[PDB]
Amino acid sequence: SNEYDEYIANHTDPVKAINWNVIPDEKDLEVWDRLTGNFWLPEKIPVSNDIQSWNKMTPQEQLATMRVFTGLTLLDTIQGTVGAISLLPDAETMHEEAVYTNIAFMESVHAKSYSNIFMTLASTPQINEAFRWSEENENLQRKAKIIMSYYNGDDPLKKKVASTLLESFLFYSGFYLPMYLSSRAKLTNTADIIRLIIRDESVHGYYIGYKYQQGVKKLSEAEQEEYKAYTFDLMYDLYENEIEYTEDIYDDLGWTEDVKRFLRYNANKALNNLGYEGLFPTDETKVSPAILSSLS
């Protein structure tokens, strides 16, 4: 009795090889093409040129950056090693499974970019302090564990909701700082790395939200309403926790009010990516022009 016979039994259909000549969902190919074409590595950006401006930054600024970047690094660590991966089994097409492997890899590249920035500008005590801060912080650990509870759960649709919220919402309490600083001529090369990351995350959230929408419409009227309710519920939970997290990061700086608006702006985009209307009135998402500007 071969150590594998039992398996070859429980799985009688032939194992299929991916065929990119027959694509059910052209969306997978458009996205595969956009993500692979947007390949980049942090080494290609001269972060060493931000050393002067990094020095010109106040202590509170350097400190906020270390922490924000560490929080971002942590989210991409989860998304690359646990998130994107958890979506594989529920893929509608094999081409979609291929896209998720690109997403998982690009997330490791995102996490690594921050280390390239840190190592070029910061000091080890700073790096070490930042990383310790990230393990101790209750709001950061809380959002990291809520998202993980879903990836480790058994609900395919929920995993996609959590992932779209992480990609379209959780990352921005963070992207705000480098966009703020770069509009004020601080850490511009570093902002270029952030822009490449943002170019990926916008696609990631768009694509995964798209797959959640196609999945959800495959359900009964009642179930569809339950998933809608589930999404808004998690969105509020994540949002409240992000508020407390934002207060702790930006208050010394006094950027808090503008950051909170940036959060509501992205919470809406995350819900739209999932096919739902926003959670916040438009007037409550009036983020400073200079910020949404730095982006595009």
Add this chain to the structure above:
Amino acid sequence: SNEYDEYIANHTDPVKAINWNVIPDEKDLEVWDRLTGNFWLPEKIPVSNDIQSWNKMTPQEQLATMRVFTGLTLLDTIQGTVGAISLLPDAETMHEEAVYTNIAFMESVHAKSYSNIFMTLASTPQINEAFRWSEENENLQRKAKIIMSYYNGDDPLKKKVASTLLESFLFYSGFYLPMYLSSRAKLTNTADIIRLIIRDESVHGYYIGYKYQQGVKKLSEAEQEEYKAYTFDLMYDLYENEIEYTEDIYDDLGWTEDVKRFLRYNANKALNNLGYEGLFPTDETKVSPAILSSLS
């Protein structure tokens, strides 16, 4: 708001962010730089320039080529969506996890490469016949499922042995064809894609084998003997299966005996990657230096 409470409750340990500033195993960084530095996409090679060569090939050579590439596509599909992934949970470091995400993505790039070749050279009927052929070939499905049985199992070391045997041995009955044709000045651009793939597999086999050695060295001398026994028994089973697959593919062309020597040559490398002596003596592993060079 309550649903994810038990999960947190039980997971009171801090989720950690990856830190590339502190590398406990230098090999992880070396392999990461090597694999990312070797990034490539099939669109980069002028496969269309092989059209003249392809058309001059006999129907038998074409048929064998279609079949070996569909077989190769199937192995990469598995490795990319099931294999590399199944290794993340057993990683010794987080940087090793990062490496596996790159392996997963490059396996999808590999699989996609065969389709770019097909779409450029073969007729759709040929393409459909080839994938259909791969779903029904007993030996191909048997090696796919033997390997999958281990990725789905619960032994971390056996997943690495299976993966290493896949990377350093199982692809080779298929790699023989393009290397040989390449040595006859045929399908040379396709061969450049195959060489890029081999450049990746070589490193995957070596890295995963190296992590297997690290884990096995931690066990008692006796347990280490059982894992060696298990590794050789799997190699015997895979080799016997591979000979039959080889016959199915190469008998018409009459290249079987030479492909079997090439299987033996690579079976020794795969065992060496796992830290063991080769199985076949040198005089049974003769490979034309025109194929070896065509390799590197």
